[PDB]
Amino acid sequence: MEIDKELAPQDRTVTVATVLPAVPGPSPLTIKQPFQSEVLFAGTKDAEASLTIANIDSVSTLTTFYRHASLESLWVTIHPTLQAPTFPTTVGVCWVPAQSPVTPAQITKTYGGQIFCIGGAIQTLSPLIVKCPLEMMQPRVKDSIQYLDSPKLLISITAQPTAPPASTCIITVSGTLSMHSPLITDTST
Amino acid sequence: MEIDKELAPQDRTVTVATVLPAVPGPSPLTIKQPFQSEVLFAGTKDAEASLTIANIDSVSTLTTFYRHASLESLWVTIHPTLQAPTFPTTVGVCWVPAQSPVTPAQITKTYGGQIFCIGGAIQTLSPLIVKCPLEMMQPRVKDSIQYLDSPKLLISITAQPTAPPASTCIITVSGTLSMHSPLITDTST
Amino acid sequence: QDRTVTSPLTIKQPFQSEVLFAGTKDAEASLTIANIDSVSTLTTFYRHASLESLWVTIHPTLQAPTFPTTVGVCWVPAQSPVTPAQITKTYGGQIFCIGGAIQTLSPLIVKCPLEMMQPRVKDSIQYLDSPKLLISITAQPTAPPASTCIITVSGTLSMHSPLITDTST
Amino acid sequence: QDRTVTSPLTIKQPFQSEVLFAGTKDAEASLTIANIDSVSTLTTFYRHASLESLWVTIHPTLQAPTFPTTVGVCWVPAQSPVTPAQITKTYGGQIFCIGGAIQTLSPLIVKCPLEMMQPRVKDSIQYLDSPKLLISITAQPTAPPASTCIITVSGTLSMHSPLITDTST
Amino acid sequence: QDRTVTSPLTIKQPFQSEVLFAGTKDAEASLTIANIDSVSTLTTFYRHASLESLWVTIHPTLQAPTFPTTVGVCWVPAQSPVTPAQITKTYGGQIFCIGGAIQTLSPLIVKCPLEMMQPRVKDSIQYLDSPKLLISITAQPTAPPASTCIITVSGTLSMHSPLITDTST
Amino acid sequence: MEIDKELAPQDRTVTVATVLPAVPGPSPLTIKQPFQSEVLFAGTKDAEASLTIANIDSVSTLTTFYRHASLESLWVTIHPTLQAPTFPTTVGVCWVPAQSPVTPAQITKTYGGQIFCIGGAIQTLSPLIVKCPLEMMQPRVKDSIQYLDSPKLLISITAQPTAPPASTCIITVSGTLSMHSPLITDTST
């Protein structure tokens, strides 16, 4: 009984982030909200992607009525589709604090930066999963101020020269949120 | 000796569900009924499916003679057929409360939802299994009231561009019901 | 009349309501005693109501003797697929010959197996397995002047927790 | 209705099935309730099934009054040599006059003496002394329009141990 | 059905035997159930036989409705001077109107007061106070096609101590 | 050091069988006899198979001189031949009590029912083994009476559209018997 997911863990390093602590007072309640959003749909045309988890519409939508929200768990998944087999394609993944000057074309020049060969060869199909190291990141996704070391995702796709009819893989980002403190706004809608 | 069945477990989250409390009286007789019913037969044409485990034949018929039925174990499984090798196929799966407004066309936008690449000689063919987290669903598949958190199954299937002669895999749902309190009905058939 | 096992101040209100007048024309009837006049008006001032006793009865009448009439009843959980055209196929099955001509006798009774279906006829939620009655009259081929019998439903309700409605009328 | 002495999760399913429609033509019937529709479909998903209660009933109907009809029943161990043409010769013997014309009344019942025959209607082995019913209709010399009565078999089953069959339909 | 007080392996065999077929001609019958077919054949292989239960029954039939028929029964100690022409004069007295026309219903039963007469129907000695039945049919003045009813005797025997006879047939 | 056999265990459920116990007396001696019989030789033409282990000639032949015999261990094996590689084929297996109304075309509609893709893709070659659950069956293969819940095997083969030159796999049934009590018959032969 083996698990259908496959892991390619990103190299780590000790890096604490500055974070504002709530004013002395009565602890407020708190819920947690899970989420999975689409990031990319590559395979056909060479394309890169560099998004800041802090602003994914999914997150945007959930934290809507709370003034405080942090990232419990976060991570990217690469799901090879029915094209991945016939169209091996290169994929680059790298979690970097939104406050880092790197671009997707520098994945392999950045410490964590990884390169994958989604599809083609033997065993090149189980969905990949790269857990974002909030340990190194700045998990504060919504606060009293706007932080900078917030989690940012990088992606680089090197499509086949003779492109596949359709996308070879779907790239989603998932995680769980932990938010609290109501934002006294208009709830009319 | 390894097991010919690989499982891809859906990520969960703490989510309770209320449920009609036991009516005053003495414990009642009860039975458990296992079951497996075909939900899909694809690989040949793009097609999605969104059925409520609460109403699938095997269940639909087993509960017919009781006023109450609860799911002991429940899970969906994909069996690649002899076409699976020649025709890699994308299959998406997601368990959500029958009360979730989610459509299979948006599985990858729903927390749990996952998508697999069943097929392609370049890799494994063991039956994939996605056990429905009843911890999250509303296990009461049949009762005195009409709960709505009841388990619902989402499937999405993108077939090969140049479809295979026949289906590349059979998608079935298995489980065990715990029923009791006979429902007066016509047993003629 | 069969078998098969498996703090708030409350009151008990007995009742009987005419459910069907027949014998003059073949006819099926599938009513859920959970909504019959009496019950309706009785539970009107409460939020919780359950059946203590429940049963159907057919009062043979004057015509009964001059016009034999087949009549069937069958108690069933409102959440059940059975239809009147199939009573003797059901467990609560039961058929009669009301006014088996020159017959006479008190009205036939048919205790509803409540220990076999949600007897809460009124609550905070909407139940399904509530008691539902199935009638099946098949009048004489040559219709009678009036009805050969009166089918009524009698029972007792256990209610409590006042419902803040208008008590005008 | 007579006398003469001598761990696995189970459920209880009640039932009633029309065994015979008669009154229009003399006829004998010798069925083994161990195989009647209801029972058949009910035990379908188990490997062990036994009878909790069992009895036959005759529902006099509309014609009953206009066409007296002799009808006989007799419960007997399926592994018994008796035939319908000889009911009153048997202990379970019992005869009626269904629709004794202008009669009427609920249907006649005849409890089967289960404590007198293997009530296991389904098992790992094939039993013989299982319950078998004997019917014996002798219609009016001048046939009636329709049947004078409906003979049904009602009972409760005690089952358990799922049988791995197809639950498609 | 009345009142008035005052080691060896055994088995119990139940039974029913047709004692009389009538309704077509006035007739008296005075048989001692101690010697009826069933009993006869049953006690055949024992030396000691006693009655556990015993009673007479009349199965109204098809003709019953078209031909009312007076019929009388009376259980009496075989060693008793009473005759059928005098049943209502006896304590076990009992009369009916089998096929009281347009009547119908199960067969009439008449429990024999065994705690009132030697129930040993077979023994080492010849008893006298054994159970004896008295029947008294008085058919319609205008005879019916067939018999209006069947009079049978049912009971249970308690036997023991094998009788060394031929078990060929 | 991995084992060349591969296992695909059939879903179980609690189901006891009625079984006659020997009359009070002196326990008799008992031997055990192993056995492997051919069941099917598919791959070339679509074909099904539904046999009752209780009457396999192999069993028939062994229990020949004993009036009592039960199934110690029982199971099916699918051995892909030199054709399995080039001719992926579908196989359905399901153990069901001889007293169950199911047919091989209903494998996937029966609780245990499994579907395999013998050959073609990667790792689709090690011999499969489906152990019959005597736990659920009626192990009594030869007794004082004839039982019904005896073990029965179901098989369904979906051969390649363009059939292989020869069979793609050999299907055998194996097990060990446990018998005792001599059947006083004529041993002339």
Curated annotation (Swiss-Prot), chains A, B, F:
Disulphide connectivity of cysteines: none
Family, similarity comment: Belongs to the tymoviruses capsid protein family.
Modified residues (N-acetylmethionine): M1
Single GO term (MF): structural molecule activity
Keywords: Acetylation, Capsid protein, T=3 icosahedral capsid protein, Virion
Protein name: Capsid protein
Chief location: virion
Subcellular location(s) of the protein: Virion
Protein function: Self-assembles to form a T=3 icosahedral capsid composed of 180 copies of the capsid protein. The capsid encapsulates the single-stranded RNA genome. A pentameric unit may be lost during decapsidation.
Cellular component GO terms, alphabetical: T=3 icosahedral viral capsid
Record InterPro entries: Tymo_coat, Viral_coat
From Swiss-Prot, chains C, D, E:
Role, per record: Self-assembles to form a T=3 icosahedral capsid composed of 180 copies of the capsid protein. The capsid encapsulates the single-stranded RNA genome. A pentameric unit may be lost during decapsidation.
Family statement drawn from the similarity comment of this UniProt entry: Belongs to the tymoviruses capsid protein family.
Main location group: virion
Record bears the keyword Electron transport: no
Stored SUPFAM superfamilies: Positive stranded ssRNA viruses (SSF88633)
Protein name: Capsid protein
UniProt keyword terms in alphabetical order: Acetylation, Capsid protein, T=3 icosahedral capsid protein, Virion
GO cellular component terms, semicolon-separated: T=3 icosahedral viral capsid
Top-rank taxon, per record: Viruses
Annotated organism of origin: Turnip yellow mosaic virus
